């Protein structure tokens, strides 16, 4: 027995209260509008014209305000998110700057100068939805359970997906189609993205960069950098017997070509280099700040760069001859990208554009002036900034050629189908690779990721790993500086690389220090370095988000402080024991001693993927060994948000887990606290949502017990007459009549109407009365005397909702009556009439439709078991066992073994025991409740102990030989009803380009007959039907051509021969005639030769 | 004939729009209005 603290389950809620799931999406933006927005202002700080050096403007301070709207005339009132969501407006706040400009001779300092607007997040620091109370949240008509984190642009909720990319400022050594090759990608803050690569062929190293014409020898690059004597070159490379046999050839081919001085190498390079000022200076400045710009050069010293290239060559040599290769599947190198730095790049590019083009606005006015003073605030504009921001957010085209980048599909509309689909989309992560079949590694589950990305959470289909979700406990590190870090490392006793030569780095005892892909120097006895750095980090002086690791195969220590790293807290242990005790957590339960002081007391700490590489972590407290360094808080935090709804995930199989986590976001239910006020395009709601009996701790963490998307129902696992085939399930007619599974659909119909540049307008006449009696006509029946439909009415098929009459171009008006198209008979809920930002009237209507479950509706079991309903059985059937309880949904026992789902029976047992006793049973992953204490509790009541009951068949009236498995199960209703998945067409509209059925059901189109279905008709050998349903029913056309010269005539007449003597006709599909008429314009004339079918 | 009665969403005051007027409220500064329920007789099924 070992002392075990059963209290560490309350650390996780206190940790999520600080940050975590979605609070980091707001942290990245709150830090960006407080730190980087002024860094960009300081970057572009002074700009002046060149006409005469007397005019200039200066940037003092910049800041943003609160969400405000500019109405008719100087009307700035605080607007709420719901108002912007209903008025199709955009949630944004202005950016007021305090700049100074010199006009004439004196200087003018105009305070509070507006330059544009910028969108603000829903739960950010500048918004009104922060620090409020639920009573006040109900005052602004907003759900308090809304996590937020999206953008409202033109009345839609847009969220920016997190995108993962590879690490920059690092060396990779990977193998390709022939051999091994090293590469280096360089990209700092300033826009300079470079990709250099060193390759090996014929025992000769060659350096490739897109600025050079062809290969340049590495020894030539060395001699050009400044290292002249060939001895210290090999000294820097490596002093070993096997590294010289591979470096001799290059040295001797270098001696072959007559290059022995720096000027010779520089002239050689300049002659090699092509670019569209002499050759020596060209080659000098090209080796200075073009190839590797992440290694700064003070005056003109290429020593750090040449030692960097030498250690790169040494890594390539040690990779050469072995099977040690670097892969891109490691997640310790992969970095994440939020919406903060994207907005940063967008804003800095827009600001640079606005500063550089306005520099040209006052550059054509100074010589061609009219007075002595020039005002610049009247030569100022505030539409490009707002336009660019809104366009980049809504459109989704991140195109920055100043940054040399084009990205599509970054922002997406927030899924508002259910409460899980909304939160689960915020943790969705996108990859940099495109959706292709070639990938198998990155799609495969990597052993590197542990507790950072949910393994089960992934969509099944085409993308099978390109889309991943975050874990419950993880944190994204923001960027820092490295001043104090380098200072403390220099004080610890690290050596300057500029003093010692190349020979000492080949020493095994010597270790190299790397900081964000930068060589700081040489350190001996790296263990003391790592220990002291870790102790200083645990102290509190250095920030906690600084990684340190050591690698012995290449003998280098890495110090990582870049932003975008994954961090999760771990409990520290000291030589046999966790530092956290019972007295430390009793205070946390009391109300003091929270997470931040726990970190300040050196009891827990963050570790990254690369830092946990050199650490031992214990799963539980009974497996703690003498080399374990950290202790994982809880093992059930590995599962994600969508995987936390599955009872007993370890009992279930991974395909079923994936199916269920994918179907959890499609399950329909309640949306939030304000679903009657919000008017979305499509909304699915339930009538009476029940509460899951067997709930999970993750359910309580997210508070899913307030917005459930399912219902509890009695299930009987047994075969029925004939309608529980592979996935079919049987319903109870009496239960369906009582109201089990009642659904509601809400559709939106919005119409905007505006004015024009002339005095033309739009108008709504309204209803039409006849001459016999005073009744509205059948066309306009629901319309009110105003001209719109009144709520609380019933609209049938092809009836007018609103009359819209607009002029053709006194003027003639064409009426465009909006007509409702639907197979069902809809109902009107409410009507909203408002105005938008551009002075146009907007009329919105919400249409309600109540539906009941029928044969052809898809249901799930919340265990990866989906099926359409089979036969609807009345209550005379569906046998009761003893008390008179009938099966609500009949389940088939034949789909259990193949699917291999054992958690379903355990969940049923736990739910039955709970509904009998009267308390909810915990079913969390890697724990919960067992099947030993629950079955003995099912005996006290009087039922059987595991699952069995005596049933009496109803259709015959005889008992059942074998026993049946009865119990309550949490079922959920999904989308894709048979009411919408039902189409039929005989003769409808056709396209103008080709006479063929159009695409889609919204335009009443047909079905497509592809080649794979044509192959089935060909393999049979039927020719009449193959021609009947491709030419007779699709497009039958009668064309005419001539016998003298094969050409398409008209009206039995040719324009080439100008004679109707040789004229005949035939039957051809319109597609073939169109192809002929298209090819005749390509200098390809299909001269046809007719004949009699008798011939 | 009878002025079209409309209700607001902040004060819920039943006002009327005369003809081509700025769509607002005479009590508050809210710019969105709602509509009343029809005074006809609609039949429903209790099945």
């Amino acid at each position: 027995p070992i002392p075990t603290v059963e209290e560490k389950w309350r650390l996780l809620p206190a940790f999520l209260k600080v940050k975590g799931l979605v609070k980091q999406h707001i942290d990245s933006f709150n830090y960006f509008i407080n730190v980087e927005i002024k860094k960009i202002m300081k970057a572009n700080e002074k700009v002046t014209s060149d006409a005469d050096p007397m005019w200039y403007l200066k940037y003092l301070n910049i800041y943003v305000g609160l969400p405000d709207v500019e109405e008719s005339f100087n009307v700035t009132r605080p607007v709420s998110p719901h108002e912007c969501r209903l008025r199709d407006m955009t949630y944004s706040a202005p950016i007021t700057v305090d700049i100074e400009y010199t006009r004439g001779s004196q200087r003018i300092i105009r305070n509070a100068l507006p330059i544009g607007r910028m969108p603000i997040m829903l739960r950010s620091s500048n918004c009104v939805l922060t620090g409020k109370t639920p009573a006040e949240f109900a005052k602004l008509n907003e759900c308090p359970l809304d996590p937020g984190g999206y953008f409202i642009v033109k009345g839609v909720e847009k969220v920016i997906l997190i995108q993962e990319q590879l690490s920059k400022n690092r060396i990779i050594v990977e193998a390709d189609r022939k051999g091994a090759v090293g590469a280096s990608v360089t990209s700092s803050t300033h826009e300079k993205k470079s990709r250099t690569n060193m390759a090996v062929k014929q025992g000769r190293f060659y350096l490739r960069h897109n600025t050079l014409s062809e290969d340049i020898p590495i020894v030539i690059i060395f001699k050009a950098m400044g290292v002249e004597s060939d001895q210290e070159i090999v000294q820097m490379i490596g002093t070993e017997e096997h590294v010289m046999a591979a470096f001799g050839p290059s040295l001797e081919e270098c001696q072959k070509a007559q290059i022995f001085t720096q000027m010779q190498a520089l002239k050689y390079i300049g002659n090699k280099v092509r670019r569209q000022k002499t050759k020596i200076e060209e080659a000098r400045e090209l080796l200075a700040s073009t190839i590797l710009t992440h290694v700064p050069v003070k005056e003109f010293n290429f020593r750090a760069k040449c030692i960097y290239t030498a250690v790169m060559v040494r890594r390539v040599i040690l990779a050469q001859g072995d099977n040690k290769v670097d892969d891109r599947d490691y997640y310790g190198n992969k970095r994440l990208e939020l919406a903060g730095q994207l907005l940063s790049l967008l804003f800095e590019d827009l600001f640079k554009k606005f500063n550089s083009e306005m520099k040209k606005i006052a550059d054509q006015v100074i010589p061609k002036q009219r007075a002595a003073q020039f005002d610049v605030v009247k030569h100022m504009r505030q539409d490009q900034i707002t336009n660019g921001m809104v366009n980049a957010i809504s459109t989704g085209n991140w195109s920055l050629k100043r940054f040399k980048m084009d990205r599509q599909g970054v922002t997406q509309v927030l899924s508002r189908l259910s409460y899980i689909s909304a939160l689960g989309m915020m943790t969705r992560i996108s990859s940099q690779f495109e959706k292709t079949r070639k990938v198998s590694g990155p799609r495969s589950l990597q052993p590197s990721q542990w507790g950072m990305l949910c393994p089960s959470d992934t969509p099944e289909g085409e993308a099978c790993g390109l889309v991943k979700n975050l874990a419950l406990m993880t944190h994204i590190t923001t960027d820092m500086e490295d001043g104090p870090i380098v200072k403390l490392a220099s004080n610890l006793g690290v050596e300057d690389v500029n003093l010692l030569c190349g020979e000492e780095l080949s020493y095994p005892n010597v270790f190299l220090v790397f900081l964000n892909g930068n060589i700081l120097g040489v350190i001996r006895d790296h263990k003391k370095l790592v220990n002291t750095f870790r102790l200083m980090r645990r102290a509190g002086y250095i920030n906690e988000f600084v990684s340190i690791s050591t690698n012995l195969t290449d003998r280098c220590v890495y110090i990582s402080s870049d932003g975008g790293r994954l961090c999760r807290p771990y409990i520290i242990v000291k030589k046999q024991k966790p530092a956290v005790t019972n007295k430390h957590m009793e205070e946390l339960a009391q109300g003091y001693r929270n997470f931040e002081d726990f970190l300040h007391e050196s009891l827990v700490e963050y570790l990254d993927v690369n830092e946990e590489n050199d650490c031992n972590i214990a799963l539980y407290e009974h497996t703690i060994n003498k080399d374990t360094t950290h202790l994982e808080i809880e093992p059930f935090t590995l599962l994600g948000v969508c995987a936390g709804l599955i009872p007993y995930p370890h009992h279930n199989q991974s395909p079923r887990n994936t199916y269920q986590c994918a179907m959890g976001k499609q399950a329909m239910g309640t949306i939030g606290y304000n679903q009657r006020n919000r008017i979305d395009t499509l909304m699915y709601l339930l009538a009476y949502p029940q509460k899951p009996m067997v709930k999970t701790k993750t359910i309580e963490l997210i508070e899913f017990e307030k917005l459930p998307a399912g219902q509890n129902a009695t299930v009987a696992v047994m075969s029925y007459s004939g309608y529980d085939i592979e996935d079919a399930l049987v319903l109870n007619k009496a239960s369906l009549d009582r109201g089990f599974g009642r659904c509601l659909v809400y559709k939106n119909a919005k119409c905007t109407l505006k004015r024009y540049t002339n005095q033309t307008f739009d108008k709504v006449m309204g209803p039409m009365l006849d001459a016999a009696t005073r009744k509205p006509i059948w066309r306009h029946e629901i319309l009110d005397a105003d001209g719109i439909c009144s709520p609380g009415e019933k609209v049938e098929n092809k009836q007018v909702l609103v009359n819209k009459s607009m002029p053709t171009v006194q003027p003639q008006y064409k009426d465009v009556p909006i007509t409702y198209k639907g197979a069902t008979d809809s109902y009107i809920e409410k009507v909203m009439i408002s105005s938008n930002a551009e002075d146009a009237f907007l009329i919105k209507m919400l249409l309600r439709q109540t539906r009941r479950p029928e044969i052809g509706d898809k249901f799930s079991s919340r265990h990866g078991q989906k099926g359409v309903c089979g036969l609807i059985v009345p209550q005379e059937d569906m046998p009761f066992c003893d008390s008179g309880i009938c099966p609500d949904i009949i389940m088939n026992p034949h789909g259990f073994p193949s699917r291999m789902t054992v958690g379903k029976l355990i969940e049923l047992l736990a739910g039955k025991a709970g509904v009998l006793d009267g308390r909810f049973h915990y079913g969390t992953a890697f724990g919960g409740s067992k099947v030993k204490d629950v079955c003995e509790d099912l005996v006290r009541h009087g039922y059987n102990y595991l699952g069995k009951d005596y049933v009496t068949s109803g259709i015959t009236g005889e008992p059942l030989e074998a026993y049946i498995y009865f119990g309550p199960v949490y079922y959920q209703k999904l989308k894709h009803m048979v009411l919408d998945k039902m189409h039929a067409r005989a003769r409808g509209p056709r396209a103008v380009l080709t006479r063929q059925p159009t695409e889609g059901r919204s335009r009443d189109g047909g079905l497509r007959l592809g080649e794979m279905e044509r192959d089935c008709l060909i393999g049979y050998g039927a020719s009449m039907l193959l021609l009947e349903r491709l030419m007779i029913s699709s497009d039958a056309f009668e064309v005419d051509v001539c016998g003298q010269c094969g050409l398409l005539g008209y009206s039995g007449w040719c324009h080439y021969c100008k004679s109707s003597c040789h004229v005949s006709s035939l039957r051809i599909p319109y597609a073939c005639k169109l192809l002929f008429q298209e090819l005749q314009s390509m200098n390809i004339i299909p001269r046809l030769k007719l004949s009699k079918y008798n011939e | 004939q009878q002025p079209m009665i409309y209700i607001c969403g902040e004060c819920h005051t039943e006002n009327e729009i005369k003809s081509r007027d700025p769509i607002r409220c005479r009590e508050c500064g809210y710019r969105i209005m709602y509509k009343k329920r029809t005074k006809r007789l609609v039949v429903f099924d209790a099945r």
């Binding site: 307008f761 108008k763 709504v764 309204g766 009365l769 006509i777 005397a785 105003d786 001209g787 | -």
Partner: peptide
């Protein structure tokens, strides 16, 4: 420029 509250008779 708008016009509402109309009834057309046939």
């Amino acid at each position: 420029m708008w016009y509402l509250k109309g009834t057309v008779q046939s």
